[PDB]
Design a protein around this ligand. Structure first.
Ligand SMILES: Nc1ncnc2c1ncn2[C@@H]1O[C@H](COP(=O)(O)OP(=O)(O)O)[C@@H](O)[C@H]1O
Ligand SMILES: Nc1ncnc2c1ncn2[C@@H]1O[C@H](COP(=O)(O)OP(=O)(O)O)[C@@H](O)[C@H]1O
Ligand SMILES: Nc1ncnc2c1ncn2[C@@H]1O[C@H](COP(=O)(O)OP(=O)(O)O)[C@@H](O)[C@H]1O
Ligand SMILES: Nc1ncnc2c1ncn2[C@@H]1O[C@H](COP(=O)(O)OP(=O)(O)O)[C@@H](O)[C@H]1O
Ligand SMILES: Nc1ncnc2c1ncn2[C@@H]1O[C@H](COP(=O)(O)OP(=O)(O)O)[C@@H](O)[C@H]1O
Ligand SMILES: Nc1ncnc2c1ncn2[C@@H]1O[C@H](COP(=O)(O)OP(=O)(O)O)[C@@H](O)[C@H]1O
Ligand SMILES: Nc1ncnc2c1ncn2[C@@H]1O[C@H](COP(=O)(O)OP(=O)(O)O)[C@@H](O)[C@H]1O
Ligand SMILES: Nc1ncnc2c1ncn2[C@@H]1O[C@H](COP(=O)(O)OP(=O)(O)O)[C@@H](O)[C@H]1O
Ligand SMILES: [Mg+2]
Ligand SMILES: [Mg+2]
Ligand SMILES: [Mg+2]
Ligand SMILES: [Mg+2]
Ligand SMILES: [Mg+2]
Ligand SMILES: [Mg+2]
Ligand SMILES: [Mg+2]
Ligand SMILES: [Mg+2]
Ligand SMILES: [Mg+2]
Ligand SMILES: [Mg+2]
Ligand SMILES: [Mg+2]
Ligand SMILES: [Mg+2]
Ligand SMILES: [Mg+2]
Ligand SMILES: [Mg+2]
Ligand SMILES: [Mg+2]
Ligand SMILES: [Mg+2]
Ligand SMILES: [Mg+2]
Ligand SMILES: [Mg+2]
Ligand SMILES: [Mg+2]
Ligand SMILES: [Mg+2]
Ligand SMILES: [Mg+2]
Ligand SMILES: [Mg+2]
Ligand SMILES: [Mg+2]
Ligand SMILES: [Mg+2]
Ligand SMILES: [Mg+2]
Ligand SMILES: [Mg+2]
Ligand SMILES: [Mg+2]
Ligand SMILES: [Mg+2]
Lengths: 149, 146, 149, 146, 149, 146, 149, 146
């Protein structure tokens, strides 16, 4: 009744509680984030080149997060107003890496499509996670358009 | 405790038995862009919906021209006053009968783009993304507007 | 002799004196304004994307109004000189929101096509108004190209 | 007082009786761009006139190619040395006999663009914007050069 | 043997010594100058939009002249190096407006195709002049591509 | 003194008697761009010469394709690796027999662009700008390399 | 058995030890270098316009070298992130001009395709060299795409 | 000492006797871009290899479409999602039998671009750059990955 795919997924589920958030998250070095101080042309190019829809919007560096922006809203602001509208950003959802995957899933269920940032106590961004990252731990890779197929 | 794992295992072991119809976003809930709408109408639709990809169609849902990314559509609508057809992505379309395991292989190859479910005559029955499959294993991940 | 359209317009006229400027003006959040400190490419994009012909030109923020610019003149300056020519701007016409619509109409008649800014005593811009905004209070919506039809 | 309201009400109640001819900017006062003029001539014309939209024509007013926004025309003239035809807006044109109430519906749909008034043979009789109708109700809103 | 054209030119010659440099020069407000602090895209656009070949290159404002640049050299620098190369600029030739046209002609003969700046004792640029400006005083207008024909 | 004026008046009164041949830059001194040269060669030629406008030709001077502005040619050569033909200006060409007064009217209409002097078979005899005429009245304004 | 080409190359080899690094290097004035403080559009244009693959990446001026960048990596960073990623740069290899060509060849053999900078004791960049520069001293010119053929 | 010079002189005096085959990068070691690969695959290939120029081919090495510069290919892959054919450089191709001296003349004219070595039927045998010739005189200049 069941085959290799199911067995692998069941194994995945039974190891979630042992794996770290660090092991599944998109790491700091691969975070795509918008520097609100960049010029409109630069940001616009970045938004179209990335496969992602939500972006931390920050002032000068990744750790200086002002909010989370939706690409489709950001592009509109940048074209018509020449800058990101700060008051249109969503509040970040942020967790510590130590909470583990089961607790993180509860948070992701409440995040309504928004990425979750992983940060230390001093506010340093360690990475970010979405439901896809957890699902991959169960069912295997769903690579982005700019990742190996 | 241990319940979350038990429930997820149960979910996995019933995947091959459930239909695509039972997990997909149904036709009635599809957000799609009518390329013949005026630009202000489409712009409003795009910001109001929570989704990032939209079928882009001429006049009705079944008349699919391509799949558009909202962030690209928005820029075109503002700078060109219309959706640029030649910027749209090719649709990925499956028949509902292929089952969830086969659909998962397709979704892995879709690289983030929604997959349309259509009959042999081209009628769109719904659409599906990896989240829809994940929900069958792990419970609901409600959209912003749900 | 008269029908629904006339009755509605007459009702509109007979309620002008009761309605506030706030209720008819384009509000602060929707003001399209040019930041004289932005680069030429950014401003040029903003001017072509907006349906409007006149723009407050400001230094760094909306409240820091230097003058009112005509898009067709601004585009020329930006292309040929790389910047807005400050000395070519028109002096702003500015009223307090409390003056009411009848008095505002007198001002609009004298403004010769230029938008009127609505500001508080401390110089904070609350909005802007043109004859179209008053006419809409009488005759119904005349939506811009980027507003719902 | 109360006079402003009385006068505006009187204006409203005589709208359906007045002709489009009586409120429009007449042919003799139309500012239009001759696409065959040299760039410096058109640039000067555009800055000197108070208007934002111009019929763009080949050789004479009746030979309308499209409607141009001054801010767009200016950029083309400087960067390309000529008016780009394919950037012009489609003209909106009515017959003078349709009356002011019907014209108002057209103006609401024109989204800021002037409406041309022309006869059946294409002769341009004048043009009209919402301001021209508003003046019939509320009195004059003189242009910069009036 | 001679007609209206000759008579007009002879009149022009016989009034040169009475006319001021101010009356023939391109005035300050119409000087096209490059701000070395502008970004490459802005300057490049300015150079192609202008009909002129030589440009004062200045730091922040017209009066802060660093040298005179040749458009064809400037464009090359801007594309390949992203900035104007200061050491490639030519030294400015500068006169006071009071020297009169006959003396200015001697200077123009020595300027080898380069525009001459007209400045006051405090270094404020009042305008610029080339042989065309003097010739126009004799023979009538030779308008630029962006001037009325 | 008074000599400068006397000499300039004498110059004016002999203009209608002098030939275009006698004031033009002769064929042998024409700087022209061979569109078939490699980009580095043309770039070097453009910086080395003092002139701003160049006939752009295919293989030989008489095979004129258009007139190019150095600042435009340079950008094309760097970004495209070649001269873009469709960016060139239309040549203005006169016969040497028209005389200086008529040539002056042409130069006034050329808006800064050099005028070519050619025979009926298309052979380029030289070129002329307002400076060449001015020199006939006022004495030499030597180029950087003269 | 041997002809003019061989004789010339042999002469070249027998004079290497007498020639200076200064005589073969690309001099300071012709170094193509990336200013990490420039905007993405400017740098991108510079990278495509130059025939070179490796570039010193510097902060504000050539002497302030942060590392050596590979064009293909830089372009990717600039498009997707809007800036050069400093941590992806290679460490510079730097020699003093006095070491002579034979010693420099040993260094070039170890540089694995990366250009070698020539600098004084105070860190002023005098030029840069690759194996092509040495080979030209033996076998004659191999001009770049933007150099005379 | 004096040995480096002696060895280099020996190298020079055996150039005309050595084959192109003996100095070229052989077919098996050619890095080439398959234009039909997906963008992420090509992007990874380009960053991983130490080389700057790549033959760009359709399906197999012999099906050469053009030569691409990595920095240009990368930009196209990110902005367009594919290699733009019309941006590629024309290949320079020689037969292995022409010998090293003649090849050096070709390399001097190639302006930095690799030269392909192919047979009369179009089979690519290898490729060569000035470094390959220099190594025959002066010893190895190993690539980053060698
Ligand atoms: N701004 C971002 N920067 C880096 N990675 C991101 C970003 N947003 C999403 N991701 C990653 O993209 C992958 C797919 O996640 P998904 O929820 O489908 O987002 P999206 O479709 O917006 O990329 C996940 O690995 C996720 O961690
Ligand atoms: N255009 C669309 N119309 C209707 N539902 C959609 C659309 N795009 C995605 N969905 C649904 O939204 C839910 C979340 O899917 P996800 O892949 O996160 O897409 P998104 O973030 O773009 O909404 C899924 O149930 C999916 O089927
Ligand atoms: N710079 C501006 N920013 C925001 N709204 C504006 C601006 N200029 C005009 N408007 C609004 O545009 C609408 C139409 O006004 P109108 O006088 O026709 O100006 P325009 O044609 O220049 O847009 C009115 O609601 C007016 O308040
Ligand atoms: N191109 C034009 N030629 C002549 N009159 C015009 C033109 N455009 C507008 N008008 C007139 O200018 C007056 C103000 O109209 P409005 O809609 O404010 O346009 P604008 O601000 O562009 O002049 C109206 O009487 C209108 O008919
Ligand atoms: N940088 C400049 N800014 C403004 N006017 C200029 C400039 N350079 C030349 N001119 C003006 O252009 C006109 C033609 O002069 P000319 O010597 O032919 O220069 P060019 O061909 O470079 O424009 C003259 O009126 C001259 O004063
Ligand atoms: N392409 C060219 N080849 C040869 N002579 C030229 C060329 N362009 C201009 N000249 C000559 O240069 C002199 C100065 O003319 P001018 O109009 O100032 O041009 P420019 O500043 O571009 O050299 C004149 O004698 C003119 O005939
Ligand atoms: N960034 C650079 N700036 C200036 N010259 C360079 C640079 N990189 C290489 N060169 C020069 O280019 C020529 C060819 O060297 P080569 O090793 O083939 O590098 P590339 O192919 O990257 O240009 C040599 O003269 C070398 O000194
Ligand atoms: N696309 C390629 N595939 C395989 N080898 C290459 C390629 N390009 C260059 N080479 C080899 O790399 C070595 C260094 O050559 P060089 O001209 O410095 O090129 P690069 O710096 O681009 O690798 C030479 O042996 C040359 O044959
Ligand atoms: Mg990513
Ligand atoms: Mg989602
Ligand atoms: Mg993962
Ligand atoms: Mg991934
Ligand atoms: Mg939905
Ligand atoms: Mg996704
Ligand atoms: Mg849902
Ligand atoms: Mg608006
Ligand atoms: Mg108006
Ligand atoms: Mg309103
Ligand atoms: Mg409105
Ligand atoms: Mg008028
Ligand atoms: Mg309007
Ligand atoms: Mg009027
Ligand atoms: Mg000028
Ligand atoms: Mg000159
Ligand atoms: Mg003059
Ligand atoms: Mg002039
Ligand atoms: Mg010459
Ligand atoms: Mg000139
Ligand atoms: Mg001369
Ligand atoms: Mg170089
Ligand atoms: Mg190399
Ligand atoms: Mg050398
Ligand atoms: Mg060289
Ligand atoms: Mg290799
Ligand atoms: Mg090379
Ligand atoms: Mg090797």
């Amino acid at each position: 009744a069941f085959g290799v795919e199911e067995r692998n997924m069941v194994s995945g589920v039974l190891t979630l509680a042992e794996r770290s958030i660090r092991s599944i998250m998109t790491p700091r070095t691969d975070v795509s984030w918008v520097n609100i101080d960049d010029d409109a042309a630069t940001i616009r190019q970045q938004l179209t080149a990335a496969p992602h829809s939500f972006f931390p919007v920050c002032r000068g560096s990744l750790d200086e997060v002002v909010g989370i922006g939706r690409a489709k809203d950001l592009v509109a602001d940048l074209i018509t107003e020449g800058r990101v509208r700060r008051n249109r950003l969503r509040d970040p959802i942020i967790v510590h890496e130590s909470i583990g995957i089961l607790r993180l899933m509860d948070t992701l269920k409440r995040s309504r499509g928004q990425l979750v940032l992983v940060a230390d106590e001093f506010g340093a961004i360690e990475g970010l996670v979405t439901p896809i990252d957890v699902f991959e731990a169960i069912a295997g890779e769903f690579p982005d358009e700019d990742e190996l197929p």
